[PDB]
Amino acid sequence: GLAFGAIQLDGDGNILQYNADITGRDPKQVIGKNFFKDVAPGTDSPEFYGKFKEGVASGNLNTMFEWMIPTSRGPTKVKVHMKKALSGDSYWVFVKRVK
Amino acid sequence: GLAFGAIQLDGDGNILQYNADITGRDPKQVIGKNFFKDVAPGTDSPEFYGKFKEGVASGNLNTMFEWMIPTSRGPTKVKVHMKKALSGDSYWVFVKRVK
């Protein structure tokens, strides 16, 4: 069988999206990028990325903390929950605004 | 506003999928990979990748050709149409089985 019916590529040939029933979509164009180092660089620190690596390495990631997003108009507090997925080898980061 | 509600990461912190209304999904886990060099290496040749680079470089990609997929049970012929997207800077590869 054919894996894809239509594949969307950038000018370098890298896959953006595809149709196969099955669709790959990435409206923010972040899939494959590193969350800590590329997409949300404020998280690239021992207080966030550090806790992620610890939980991955221990095999038991389940940590919750508050996080400040500095802005031009003052910091915004969010609640972060990082947790290993219940099925398979992957991890979820949940972000919710506090109050 | 918050860009993501839930982000799925691999053990290295690379983004697999996300929820934001907006969802990023990649069931084949190929977004961000190179179509010609990683995902479909048989296309990494002047007869396919070469035509893609030509059309991207010329600014007018619109080429159609037949392509053979060797298998353990004999080759399968497909029809390939590569075309620049009508809106924005991206390119579509369409693959259809011949007859």
Q: What is the CATH number of the domain that holds B79?
A: 3.30.450.20
Q: Is B28 exposed, middle or buried (0-12, 13-18, 19+ CB in 10 A)?
A: middle
Contact status, residue B33 vs residue B40, Cβ threshold 8 Å: no
Structural domain that includes position A65: 1-97
In the block, tokens 């990435």 appear at A26
- How many other CB atoms are found less than 10 A from the CB of residue A76? 14
Radius of gyration from C-alpha coordinates of chain B = 17
- DSSP for B1-39, please give it: --S-SEEEE-TTSBEEEEE---EEB-TTS-TTSBIIIII
Residues 61-90 of B with CB under 8 A from A: 78, 85, 89-90
Q: Is A36 exposed, middle or buried (0-12, 13-18, 19+ CB in 10 A)?
A: buried
Residue A54 structure tokens: 């610890």
Resolution in A: 1.5
- Are B90 and A6 within 8 A, CB to CB? no
Residue A99 structure tokens: 């109050």
- Are A92 and B20 within 8 A, CB to CB? no
Residues 8-67 of A with CB under 8 A from B: 8-18, 20, 22-28, 30-37, 39, 49, 52, 56
Q: What is the DSSP letter of A42?
A: G
- Are B17 and A27 within 8 A, CB to CB? no
Q: Which of B76, B53, B35, B49 lies closest to A6, judged by CA?
A: B35
CA atoms within 13 A on the CB side of A16: 17
Q: How far apart are CA A79 and CA A65, in angstroms?
A: 6
Q: How far apart are CA A66 and CA A81, in angstroms?
A: 9
A62 in helix, strand or coil? strand
Task: Determine the distance in angstroms separating the CA of B65 from the nearest CA of chain A, rounded to an integer.
Answer: 15
What separation in angstroms does the CA of A45 have from each of A40, A51, B44, B98? 11, 9, 39, 53
Tell me how many domains chain A contains: 1
